[PDB]
């Protein structure tokens, strides 16, 4: 029997769908786990992976991340607040890729993955750190689709966690490069009701969400710093077996709880 797991599949019997929790504290390497292993869409999260992928390129390419892109209005597609509102400005790389985690702009994170080689020069940085779950199979907005049993664009709870720990704490981008997607993700505005609410005021959150909606498809995943101690890496993604199955950020929040609970 797994008794810690009782009240994680109570939360997602309620939610009507399943829920996949994984959680490392990086002081004792405690863990916390709920269908870690299973697959999930990750929908507008890539977005995290992707801004790192892009710093990791920035290392080699001297001014790679000052670098203005002026693109047009053929770059643009729906939920693009940033990079509409400074279309008659332009944007370096840098800003794209802020954009692209903390206001999930869709045309700067199209713009970010033509410069890397597409969804398959993504999946090979992913592949480059030793990820070998991840996969970016398609671009914004058709990646969103979360059909389920479609491994298009999925990773799971266990293989986001462990790339977030490599990238924003380990050595997998240079120390400048991994101050800076940790900066990005600190600067999120669109999960305030999930991991973020689930966290001790006093204590940092970097996150980034995805939320496919459909299939009651969404997610977080983020970076916590408890005041004192070592930080905490987790993941909490949803998905649900009808179309029309709302998402829910309070089951995502609940998740989050059980998980910090759950941890030594
Ligand atoms: C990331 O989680 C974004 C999810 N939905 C976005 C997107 O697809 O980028 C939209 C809000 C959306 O409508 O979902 C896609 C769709 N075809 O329905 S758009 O408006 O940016």
């Known amino acids: 029997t797994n008794l810690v797991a009782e009240p994680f599949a109570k939360l997602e019997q309620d939610f009507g769908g399943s829920i996949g929790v994984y959680a490392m504290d990086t ?18 999260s890539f977005k995290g992976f992707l801004a790192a992928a892009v710093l990791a390129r920035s290392q080699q390419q001297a001014g790679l991340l000052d670098t203005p892109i002026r693109y047009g209005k053929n770059a643009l597609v729906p939920w693009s607040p940033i990079s509409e509102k400074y279309l008659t400005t332009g944007m370096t790389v ?14 700067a994170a199209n713009l970010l993955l033509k410069e890397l080689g597409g969804p398959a020069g993504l999946t090979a940085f992913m592949r480059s750190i030793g990820d070998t779950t991840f996969r970016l199979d398609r671009w914004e907005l058709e ?4 059909i389920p049993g479609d491994a298009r664009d999925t990773s799971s709870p266990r293989a986001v966690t462990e790339s977030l720990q490599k990238l924003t704490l380990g050595s997998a981008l240079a120390a ?3 101050q800076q997607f940790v900066d990005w993700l600190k600067g999120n505005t669109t999960g305030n009701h999930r991991i973020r609410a689930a966290v001790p005021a006093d204590w940092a959150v970097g996150d980034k969400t995805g939320t496919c909606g459909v299939y ?3 997610n977080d995943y983020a970076v916590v710093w408890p ?32 998980a910090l609970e759950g941890l030594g």
């Open 27 to 44: 002081g004792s390497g405690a863990t916390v786990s709920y269908r870690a292993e299973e697959r999930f869409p990750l929908c507008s």
């Open 94 to 107: 840098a800003e794209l890729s802020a954009a692209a985690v903390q206001y999930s702009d869709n045309a």
């Open 143 to 146: 990646l969103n689709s979360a």
């Open 176 to 178: 400048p490069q991994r």
């Open 216 to 218: 009651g498809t969404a």
């Open 227 to 258: 005041t004192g101690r070592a930080p905490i890496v987790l993941a909490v993604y949803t998905r649900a077996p009808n179309k029309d199955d709302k998402h829910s950020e309070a089951v995502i929040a609940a998740a989050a709880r059980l």
